């Protein structure tokens, strides 16, 4: 048989990872698709009169095996893939796309859905009925037969291309890891980072050497400390050349097909299609907001560049930026990244920072379960309880980089909460922190600390879900809203009483001196020009790829012209991702949606102010935010939820102040 064929019997429905092997995936996908198709056919051909229960709720109940195999499989393909998994992914993804379309383009099924009245439905049920109609229409249910056939082909080709992009990027990223033969070339690097590079080299089959793998964004962390300028250049060139040339024609094809798809569905661009299901009201609203932010961000980056040139005494190349920014931080604030690292050890950050803040705010508690089996041996499983002692869900943390794990950081759910199924949330966080050798502490940069709080904010959004229908569970909200609960959770990484709790030396346990911790805080306002510009440049790049009139010929030429036209082609501030490694938009779901971060950040910064207005880190406030916003998933209109919580529509001034844009 097959461990996907029955519900998990483990706590919280944790999948039985000890019983699951690669050979189980294809038969479970095949059984799952066949059983869901049979379910949908029974609904569509039901001789009984259409009701919410026998149509919409019946669709929500369908696909139990398929949901179980997908949850594990897609978790593995992102976090701990292998050639067998990659081959399965190539085979199955097109079939899954064709499966989704066989349901959404089932004409009698859609006719049934359209016959359901909102009369006697409760609020979430009525909202779900509209959501179902919208999902079907956006998938092509109102197209004629010829256009549906072309749509099915476009979707399948898009799914295969995005898969190839992801696989290309992983292979090229891994192959572009920078090998250093002489430890002298690592001058400037903290001792702990040297040991991690030696450990990496050992793990990747090169004992005695040192390996510096690349992180997802353009900017590589080691450039802040490495004094060997030729090595800084070599790392930066390895970064910016990811996906060249193998992703260039591929992304051109993806963007071309997206445009053709969008027109087929009645939209002038892919961005117009995307924005139609975002909280942002129009494409013009997005471009108008970006147009206001870009000139002051660019002027800040120019001032910062002048300051870095004066510090260095000479002209800079892109691979010098971080290095001289660190010198300015040390001179201005007495903050040396090498001296800050010893205060931010993973276990302490996690327990006394991330968990601690959630306990103070929400009253929830955590029990580590080293006896429960995660999907990889380094996964930590935690049981999560409400303040009253009741069971809430499971949280899995997977903190370390490895060749099988894709770049960046993310949250995903193994089990979605719904009262329909009576399921409790099982959520996952993945980071890419460099793994130390045996015995050695995991000392984190503040960027990594922030990422931990960010991903945990998504975990809380999943954990706190109290919806009826799985369609609305947890993080199932528009992309330009989903980054609000994650970004707002980062507030607790810098809330001084929390930071003071976890910023303690890994050896002595001594707190950082109050006046130094003050300066570490001040020093994070530094470099907002670079940070904002690299972000805005990537946003406008995504936008250009998904609003073009005439299709691009050359990917690299297009990128250049896109950035130049948008006034963000700065030699010293490349976009946070270049086109050929922009995983957000080519393989994850942020196409014409990378603007989502800053759109959500409006809400985040305005919410920080709400906390200050209401007395700060108090249980009453956590209960309010949980009850009014985090527990709703997609089950209410998100901006309505926000307004009920905040007391009014959002204001942008708090974001503008934060990023130096006033």
Binding site for Zn ion (CB under 5 A): 483, 486
Which among 308, 304, 271 has a CA at the least distance from the CA of 548? 271
Using the minimum distance from each CB to Zn ion, give the nearer residue, 63 or 593.
593
CB of 458 to Zn ion, least distance (A): 6
Q: Select from Zn ion, Mg ion, none the partner in contact with residue 486, using the beta carbon and a kind-dependent cut-off of 5 to 8 Å.
A: Zn ion
Q: In whole angstroms, what is the distance from residue 288 CA to residue 61 CA?
A: 42
| Residue the block writes with tokens 């092509």 | 140
Nearer to Zn ion, 480 or 483 (CB): 483
- The residues pairing with 415 across neighbouring beta strands, listed in sequence order, are 426
Q: How far is the CB of 447 from Zn ion (least distance, A)?
A: 14
Min dist. Cβ of residue 637 to Zn ion (A): 21
**Which positions lie near Mg ion, rule CB under 5 A?**
515, 518
Question: What, of Mg ion, Zn ion, none, does residue 515 touch, CB below 5 to 8 Å by kind?
Answer: Mg ion
Contact of residue 1 among Mg ion, Zn ion, none (CB under 5-8 Å per partner type): none
C-beta closer to Mg ion: residue 147 or 518: 518
Partner touching 518 among Mg ion, Zn ion, none, CB below 5 to 8 Å by kind: Mg ion
Closest approach of Cβ 497 to Mg ion, in Å? 15
Give 153 or 334: the residue with its C-beta nearer to Mg ion. 334
Residue 48 interacting entry, from Zn ion, Mg ion, none, C-beta within 5 to 8 Å by type: none
55's tokens: 């149509």
H/E element, 168 = helix 145-175
* SS3 of 81-116: CCHHHHHHHHHHHHHHHHHHHHHHCCHHHHHHHHCC
Q: Quick check: is 483 catalytic?
A: no
Strand partners, 624: none
Q: How far apart are CA 512 and CA 41, in angstroms?
A: 64
Residue 182 contact, options Zn ion, Mg ion, none, Cβ 5-8 Å cut-off depending on partner type: none
Residue (518 or 657) nearer to Mg ion, CB:
518
CB of 524 to Mg ion, least distance (A): 15
Closest contact distance (angstroms) between CB of 431 and Zn ion is 12
Q: Which residue, judged by CB position, is nearest to Zn ion in the bound state?
A: 486
Nearer to Mg ion, 518 or 637 (CB): 518
Helix axes 25-44, 83-104, angle to 10 degrees: 0
- Out of 60, 448, 455, 559, pick the active-site residue: 455
Tell me the residue nearest to Mg ion as measured from the CB.
518
- Burial of 208 from C-beta contacts in 10 A (0-12 / 13-18 / 19+): exposed
CA 525, 528, 530, 532 torsion: positive or negative?
positive
In order of 1, 343, 484, the CA distances from 660 in angstroms are 60, 28, 20
Residues serving a catalytic function are 455
């Amino acid at each position: 048989e097959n461990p996907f064929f029955a519900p998990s019997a483990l706590p919280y429905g944790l999948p039985p990872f000890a019983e699951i092997r690669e050979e189980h995936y294809v038969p479970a996908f095949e059984r799952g698709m066949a059983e869901q198709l049979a379910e949908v056919e029974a609904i569509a051909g039901d001789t009984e009169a259409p009701t919410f229960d026998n149509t919409v709720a019946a669709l929500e109940r369908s696909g139990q095996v398929l949901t179980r195999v997908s949850a594990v499989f897609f978790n593995q393909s992102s976090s701990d893939t292998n050639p067998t998994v990659q081959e399965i992914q190539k085979q199955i993804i097109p079939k899954l796309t064709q499966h989704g379309d066989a349901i959404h383009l089932n004409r009698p099924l859609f006719a049934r859905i359209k016959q359901i009245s909102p009369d006697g439905l409760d609020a979430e049920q009525a909202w779900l009925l509209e959501r179902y109609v919208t999902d079907f229409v956006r998938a092509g249910a109102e197209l004629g037969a010829g256009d549906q056939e072309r749509l099915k082909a476009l979707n399948e080709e898009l799914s295969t291309l995005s898969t190839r992009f992801e696989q290309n990027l992983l292979a090229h990223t891994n192959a572009s890891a920078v090998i250093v033969d002489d430890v002298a070339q690592l001058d400037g690097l903290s001792d702990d980072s040297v040991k991690a590079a030696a450990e990496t080299a050992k793990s990747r089959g090169l004992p005695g050497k040192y390996v510096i793998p690349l992180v997802l964004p353009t900017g590589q962390p080691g450039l802040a400390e490495l004094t060997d300028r030729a090595l800084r250049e070599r790392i930066h060139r390895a970064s910016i050349q990811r996906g060249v040339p193998d992703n260039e024609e591929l992304i051109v094809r993806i963007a071309t097909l997206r445009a053709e798809r969008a027109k087929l569905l009645g939209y002038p661009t892919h961005a117009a299609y995307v924005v139609a299901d975002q909280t942002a009201p129009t494409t013009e609203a997005v471009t108008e907001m970006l147009g206001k932010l870009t000139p002051p961000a660019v002027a800040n980056a120019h001032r910062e560049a002048d300051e870095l040139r004066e510090q260095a005494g000479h002209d800079l190349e892109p691979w010098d930026w971080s290095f001289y920014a660190e010198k300015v931080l040390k001179e201005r604030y007495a903050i040396d990244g090498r001296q800050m690292r010893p205060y931010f050890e993973l276990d302490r950050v996690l327990r006394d920072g991330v968990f601690h803040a959630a306990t103070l705010l929400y009253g929830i508690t955590f029990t580590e379960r080293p006896d429960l089996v995660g999907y990889h041996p380094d996964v930590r499983v935690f049981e999560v309880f409400n303040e009253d002692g009741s069971q809430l869900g499971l949280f899995l943390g997977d903190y370390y980089a490895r060749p099988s794990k894709r770049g960046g950081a993310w949250m995903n759910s193994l089990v979605k909460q719904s009262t329909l199924e009576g399921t409790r949330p099982v959520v996952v966080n993945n980071l890419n922190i460099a793994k130390p050798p045996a015995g050695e502490p995991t000392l984190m940069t503040f960027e990594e600390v922030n990422t931990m709080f960010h991903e945990f904010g998504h975990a809380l959004h999943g954990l706190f879900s109290e919806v009826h229908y799985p369609r609305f569970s947890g993080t199932a909200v528009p992309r330009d809203f989903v980054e609000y609960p994650s970004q707002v959770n980062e507030m607790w990484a810098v809330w001084p009483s929390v930071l003071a709790n976890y910023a303690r030396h890994w050896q002595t346990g001594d707190p950082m001196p109050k006046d130094l911790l003050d300066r570490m805080l001040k020093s994070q306002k530094y470099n907002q020009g670079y940070k904002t510009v690299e972000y805005l440049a990537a946003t406008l790049l995504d936008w250009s790829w998904h609003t073009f009139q005439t299709p691009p010929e050359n990917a690299l030429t297009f990128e250049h012209e896109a950035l130049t036209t948008a006034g963000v082609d700065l030699k010293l501030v490349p976009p946070r991702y270049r086109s050929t490694y922009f995983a957000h938009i080519w393989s994850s779901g942020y196409s014409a949606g990378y603007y989502s971060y800053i759109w959500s950040e409006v809400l985040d910064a305005d919410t920080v102010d709400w906390f200050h207005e209401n007395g700060g880190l108090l249980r009453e406030n956590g209960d309010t935010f949980r009850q009014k916003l985090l527990s709703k998933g997609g089950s209410v209109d998100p901006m309505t939820a926000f307004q009920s919580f905040r007391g009014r529509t959002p204001r942008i001034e708090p974001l503008l102040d934060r990023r130096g844009l006033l």
